[model samples]
Target: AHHWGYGKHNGPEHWHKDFPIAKGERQSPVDIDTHTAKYDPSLKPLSVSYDQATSLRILNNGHTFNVEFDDSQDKAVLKGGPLDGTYRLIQFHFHWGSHDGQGSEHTVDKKKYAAELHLVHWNTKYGDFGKAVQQPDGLAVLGIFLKVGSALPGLQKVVDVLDSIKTKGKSADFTNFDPRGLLPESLDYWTYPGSLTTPPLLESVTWIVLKEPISVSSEQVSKFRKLNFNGEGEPEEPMVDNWRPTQPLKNRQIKASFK
Candidate 1:
């Protein structure tokens, strides 16, 4: 039973063996050449609203740490941007590297960042994330890059909980947190149709990558590397460089919300 991991034997290179969609056409984390991205004035500014109580818990899912949200209601949602209808925020996770130089899933003009954050949301039209993720336009994900700079105070809550859930299958009660606090000042972004970067690479995502990157201190970024990919009973494996390389652009075009 070989599961997909960021390892030499079971890394992204071997994912195609089990999940063939790893070679899918509309794959995510594509390199964005800003010069080539067409500016679409028709694209609307992002309208994001989140309820403080919507945050449920923080979990160490082995692959990465995710902050789960209560998506049962429309309390937290993203309406505008490149989205058509209300998409409820489900969870938010991250991917990072061993160092600050490289870790982001998506690159801009071949420039990599220290890390990347993904806010997963499901279309309200589809009822639930399970059903929505099976459809082509069911899921909407917000991607935010992280650069090495000042420590983000809003992220301290999440970072502080890392030690409590260092191993896989661990979770802790987390509430009254807003995901919007993690976003950059500018909502300007590039939009594209892609698939999940992980296993069962479903091509049901509408990727909205923010142009402006948020900042985190070197000490803060190191906290993510403390996580273990293996569970409590197994040998500890540091979760570092948990990111997939950029896939081909194929026939799709990336649309920009700003000039």
Candidate 2:
């Protein structure tokens, strides 16, 4: 077995052994101290244009369920919000814990949410996502926290397909769904330079973490925990606590887009 799941020997605490950048200057999922953040007036309002037709499929990669989009064109792209160039949407995934009050990767004032949503995008300057991952400004990720409360109607489309992809390597066609419905009313966010939370922890992402969180019912969150990390023909392992811990700030400054 490859040494990477959320196991004792390959968890976040031990990631540095295989990926040294896990200990790099700028790591992701840093605890956001709201009071100390500097607000930048120059930041522009976020611009997002997602086409429902571009949504492709959903996959259970043994880590998290990823809803991938068609990035061949600018059908779904994000601009502004501390970004200098346009970035095309690649996929979106989530990180959650065993229960409410813990799953989120990034926290506000040491407060953890029920879960977190990540929308991965790559800079158009690099042409393709493969090439962008190697550049400093190659990727831009939008992070949204999910609080426990009402069930998000937009998420039902995704939740409906989970049963079909319970095991690793399973997939299902999930088309014509617009992800824009998931955003909160406010586009306010905290921006920073960081690396991917997962292994092969690349430090090329420009993170835009939203301050406002969307709501998800306890039942909705429980559905995610039901997913398995192991594939068919293997012993089943529930996929809970698929989140990385907060990393050291290391002299990094997190900028707020609003007052």
Whole-model lDDT, model 1: 0.92
Residue 4 alpha-carbon offset, candidate 1, angstroms: 1.7
Off by over 4 Å in 2: 51-53
Deviation of model 2 at 126, angstroms: 0.8
lDDT tens string, model 2, 55-101?
A: 88999999999999899987689999888889999999999998797
Model 1: per-residue Cα lDDT over 79-128, one tens digit each: 88888999999999999998989999999999999999999999999879
lDDT of 2 at 106: 94
lDDT of 2: 0.90
Candidate 2, residue 36: the lDDT equals: 90
TM-score of 2: 0.97
Cα lDDT listed for each candidate? 0.92, 0.90
Model 1 pairs in collision: none
